[PDB]
């Protein structure tokens, strides 16, 4: 997260870190047994880390639980990142508490201009690299598709939205992928892609979660 702020320990209790020896992506807890992340974060041997603030220090509220199954969206396209969404089932249910908690799925989508909270342990620099230990947070609005497309020339699909600031300085970044975009109490986005980080006229691109809720619910019901 570039241009954000330190969230405060466990203030984003649905935020998970995906670990394969090291943090590599974010995720969001959606019930005690399931995490949602980006398909482009898929790998085998994922350990889900819940209750994290400092990812390099055991502070006392963590739960480390191995993935038992990962399910990449049936129509995920790795070239364009269309349908960049994945479900991860935990080998054992998380013990839910004030620091390890689910985020509600939307019943309807979020409109342009709606303010959201984006969070993660990604790079905090727009030029070069610096990776934080504690969770970072950013408030950012959803942009209209037309403004986003005209400013950026990005090719996006109806399964993506743009959020951030066209002027630059505030954005998600490498290492935030898979993590949450929460707007008005609902998980509306997953950190997916962009061009650099926090560059002018290059806002962040997010998987549009509202389009996937029926798939999420039926997948969870059957697995
Ligand atoms: C700094 O490193 C990068 O090049 C960015 C990081 C990144 C990741 C996620 C979000 C942002 C953001 N600024 N909001 C930035 N990667 C990428 O930006 C994308 N990875 S990518 O290069 O593999 C890629 C690019 C474009 C498509 C359609 C699909 C995949
Ligand atoms: Ca920790």
Quick one: the chain helix, strand, coil %, rounded to 5? 10, 35, 55
How far is the centre of ligand 1, averaged over its atoms, from the C-alpha of 197 (Å)? 8
For the CA of 38, the nearest ligand:
1
Backbone angles phi, psi at 8, to 5 degrees: 105, 135
Closest residue by CA, ligand 1 atom 25: 193
In the chain the domains, ranked by start, together with CATH numbers, are 1-12+103-210 (2.40.10.10), 13-102+211-223 (2.40.10.10)
Pocket test for ligand 1, best of 174, 178, 201 (most atoms within 8 A of CB): 174
Ligand 1 atom at minimum distance from 177 CA: 9
Let me know if 28 is a catalytic residue. no
How far is the centre of ligand 2, averaged over its atoms, from the C-alpha of 46 (Å)? 17
> Are 197 and 123 a contacting pair, CB within 8 Å?
yes
- Residue located via tokens 């019930």: 31
Let me know if 177 is a catalytic residue. yes
Round to whole Å and give the CA distance between 55 and 28.
Answer: 16
Active site residue: 23, 28, 40, 171, which one? 40
Listed residue (209, 115, 196) closest to 152, CA to CA: 196
Cβ-proximal residues to 83 (8 Å cutoff; 6+ apart), any chain: 39, 73, 74, 75, 76, 77, 159, 207
For the CA of 53, the nearest ligand:
2
Neighbours of 175 (CB within 10 A): 22
- Determine if residue 173 is left, alpha or beta; phi over 0 gives left, psi from -120 to 50 gives alpha, anything else beta: beta
Element of type H or E holding 162? strand 160-163
Q: What is the DSSP letter of 76?
A: -
CA 43 from centre of chain: 16
CA 74 from centre of chain: 19
Round to whole Å and give the CA distance between 132 and 56.
Answer: 10
Sheet holding 186-193, edge to edge: 5-6, 136-141, 115-120, 180-183, 186-193, 204-208, 160-163
Please give the method by which this entry was determined.
Answer: X-ray
- Determine if residue 153 is left, alpha or beta; phi over 0 gives left, psi from -120 to 50 gives alpha, anything else beta: left
Cβ-proximal residues to 16 (8 Å cutoff; 6+ apart), any chain: 26, 27, 28, 29, 35, 48, 49, 50, 52
How far is the centre of ligand 1, averaged over its atoms, from the C-alpha of 194 (Å)? 4
> Are 174 and 192 a contacting pair, CB within 8 Å?
no
Neighbours of 213 (CB within 10 A): 17
> Are 163 and 188 a contacting pair, CB within 8 Å?
no
Closest residue by CA, ligand 1 atom 23: 193
């Amino acid at each position: 997260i570039v241009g954000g702020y330190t969230c405060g320990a466990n203030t984003v209790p649905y935020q998970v870190s995906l670990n394969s020896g090291y943090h590599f992506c974010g995720g969001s807890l959606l019930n005690s047994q399931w995490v949602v992340s980006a398909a482009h974060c898929y790998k085998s041997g994922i350990q889900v880390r819940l209750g994290e603030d400092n990812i390099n220090v055991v502070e006392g509220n963590e739960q480390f639980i191995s993935a038992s199954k990962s399910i990449v969206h049936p129509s995920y396209n790795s070239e364009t990142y269309n349908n960049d969404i994945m479900l991860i089932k935990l080998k054992s249910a998380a013990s839910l508490n004030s620091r390890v908690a689910s985020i509600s799925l939307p019943t309807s989508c979020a409109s342009a201009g709606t303010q959201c909270l984006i969070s993660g342990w990604g790079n905090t620099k727009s030029s070069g690299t610096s990776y934080p230990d504690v969770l970072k947070c950013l408030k950012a609005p959803i942009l209209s598709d037309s403004s986003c497309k005209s400013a950026s020339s990005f090719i996006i699909t109806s399964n993506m939205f743009c959020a951030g600031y066209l002027e630059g300085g505030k954005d998600a970044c490498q290492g935030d992928s898979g993590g949450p975009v929460v707007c008005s109490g609902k998980l509306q986005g997953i950190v997916s892609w962009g061009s650099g980080c926090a560059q002018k006229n290059k806002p962040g691109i997010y998987t549009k979660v509202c389009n996937y809720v029926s798939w999420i619910k039926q997948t969870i019901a059957s697995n």
